[PDB]
């Protein structure tokens, strides 16, 4: 895709910003659905308020058509919403408008048909009320994964912006639950902890690499994704965040080789949840969130700004999926001794749609606890 390397320019900034924040807590986000979010609202913009909210995306305007723009992420988002696709992905934007404003119907139109997004029209007068009809949403949508979303909204909250991921794949080489045991996660070096730890012995996309200086492991999903984890040697992690490049990861999924190791990798479900005007105003998207915004293409005659604006992406891994799946590999591995690749301290990862290219996650596990 034309805008694969912006999206991968954007997960990158997006990930260093959080990174800085605090090193401590696991991050986990989709840059596609956060990007994919944005760039639906700039419809609603016009003027600086637009232009901002591109570059900040990380796209030059001066270089690429706004069109082309939005032709990707519609390219994109019928890969990840098809029929046949066994991704077991689920993902909203909920835009919530104060009853009371006048919309403007092509806004509504466009977001709906083009961006699979959905509005609603809410009473902001009762805090409460819009909070809880909020959370609803999210909590249906996703069959009861992620509840209280929403914890506040300001007194003068008349537009709200909520953007949620799910993500639990099956692995299309998977995991024997019988080799599931506890064991030590570093999450000092002086320092261990107990978590599940999966394991296999066969034959892995895995190889450690000279210049980011760490393992770099390539586990494919059923359907159109790819996983890619990243374990830093000893002392570089921050090293391995650092030296990270879309062409780096493009490298590495044109490989096709495979290696035989033992791989012990932690069973894990993760969210992270973000205050978007925080985070993406560092990045320099503001005036969307300011009284100053131009949101005209949403509402012709009364002010707007978005006040309100959270993400919540939740990963689960674990050995596999479903029940059953009709189907039955053998692979052939070399009787010599293969490495043992612990995924047992902090790792980096990012999920990567097979078609696109594109960065449907990124994230850091710091303590799977």
Same mark, same amino acid.
């Given at each position: 895709?034309?805008?694969?390397?912006?999206?991968?320019?954007?997960?990158?900034?997006?990930?260093?910003?959080?990174?800085?924040?605090?090193?401590?807590?696991?991050?986990?986000?989709?840059?596609?659905?956060?990007?994919? +979010?944005?760039?639906?609202?700039?419809?609603?913009?016009?003027?600086?308020?637009?232009?901002?909210?591109?570059?900040?995306?990380?796209?030059?305007?001066?270089?690429?058509?706004? +069109?082309?723009?939005?032709?990707?992420?519609?390219?994109?988002?019928?890969?990840?919403?098809?029929?046949? &696709?066994?991704?077991?992905?689920?993902?909203?934007?909920?835009?919530?408008?104060?009853?009371?404003?006048?919309? *403007?119907?092509?806004?509504?139109?466009?977001?709906?048909?083009?961006?699979? &997004?959905? +509005?609603?029209? *809410? /009473?902001?007068?009762?805090?409460?009320?819009?909070?809880?009809?909020?959370?609803?949403? @999210?909590?249906?949508?996703?069959?009861?994964? #992620? @509840?209280?979303?929403?914890?506040?909204?300001?007194?003068?909250?008349?537009?709200?912006?909520?953007?949620?991921?799910?993500?639990?794949?099956?692995?299309? %080489?998977?995991?024997? @639950?019988?080799?599931?045991?506890?064991?030590?996660?570093?999450?000092?070096?002086?320092?261990?902890?107990?978590?599940?730890?999966?394991? %296999?012995?066969?034959?892995?996309?895995?190889?450690?690499?000279?210049?980011?200086? &760490?393992? *770099?492991?390539?586990?494919?999903?059923?359907? /159109?994704?790819?996983?890619?984890?990243?374990?830093?040697?000893?002392?570089?992690?921050?090293?391995?965040?650092?030296?990270?490049?879309?062409?780096? #990861?493009?490298?590495?999924?044109?490989?096709?080789?495979? %290696?035989?190791?033992?791989?012990?990798?932690?069973?894990?479900?993760?969210?992270?949840?973000?205050?978007?005007?925080?985070?993406?105003?560092?990045?320099?998207?503001?005036?969307?969130?300011?009284?100053?915004?131009?949101? &005209?293409?949403?509402?012709?005659?009364?002010?707007?700004?978005?006040?309100?604006? *959270?993400?919540?992406?939740?990963?689960?891994?674990?050995?596999?999926? !479903?029940?059953?799946?009709?189907?039955?590999?053998?692979?052939?591995?070399?009787?010599?001794?293969?490495?043992?690749?612990?995924?047992?301290?902090?790792?980096?990862?990012?999920?990567?749609?097979?078609? !696109?290219?594109?960065?449907?996650?990124?994230?850091?596990?710091?303590?799977?606890?």
């Amino acid at each position: 895709n034309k805008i694969t390397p912006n999206l991968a320019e954007f997960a990158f900034s997006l990930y260093r910003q959080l990174a800085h924040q605090s090193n401590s807590t696991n991050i986990f986000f989709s840059p596609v659905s956060i990007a994919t +979010a944005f760039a639906m609202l700039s419809l609603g913009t016009k003027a600086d308020t637009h232009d901002e909210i591109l570059e900040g995306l990380n796209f030059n305007l001066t270089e690429i058509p706004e +069109a082309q723009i939005h032709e990707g992420f519609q390219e994109l988002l019928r890969t990840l919403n098809q029929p046949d &696709s066994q991704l077991q992905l689920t993902t909203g934007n909920g835009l919530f408008l104060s009853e009371g404003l006048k919309l *403007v119907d092509k806004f509504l139109e466009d977001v709906k048909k083009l961006y699979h &997004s959905e +509005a609603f029209t *809410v /009473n902001f007068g009762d805090t409460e009320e819009a909070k809880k009809q909020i959370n609803d949403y @999210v909590e249906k949508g996703t069959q009861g994964k #992620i @509840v209280d979303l929403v914890k506040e909204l300001d007194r003068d909250t008349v537009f709200a912006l909520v953007n949620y991921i799910f993500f639990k794949g099956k692995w299309e %080489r998977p995991f024997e @639950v019988k080799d599931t045991e506890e064991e030590d996660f570093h999450v000092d070096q002086v320092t261990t902890v107990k978590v599940p730890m999966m394991k %296999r012995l066969g034959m892995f996309n895995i190889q450690h690499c000279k210049k980011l200086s &760490s393992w *770099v492991l390539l586990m494919k999903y059923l359907g /159109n994704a790819t996983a890619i984890f990243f374990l830093p040697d000893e002392g570089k992690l921050q090293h391995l965040e650092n030296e990270l490049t879309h062409d780096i #990861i493009t490298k590495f999924l044109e490989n096709e080789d495979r %290696r035989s190791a033992s791989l012990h990798l932690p069973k894990l479900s993760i969210t992270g949840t973000y205050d978007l005007k925080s985070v993406l105003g560092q990045l320099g998207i503001t005036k969307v969130f300011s009284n100053g915004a131009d949101l &005209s293409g949403v509402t012709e005659e009364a002010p707007l700004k978005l006040s309100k604006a *959270v993400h919540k992406a939740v990963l689960t891994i674990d050995e596999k999926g !479903t029940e059953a799946a009709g189907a039955m590999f053998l692979e052939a591995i070399p009787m010599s001794i293969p490495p043992e690749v612990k995924f047992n301290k902090p790792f980096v990862f990012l999920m990567i749609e097979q078609n !696109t290219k594109s960065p449907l996650f990124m994230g850091k596990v710091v303590n799977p606890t």
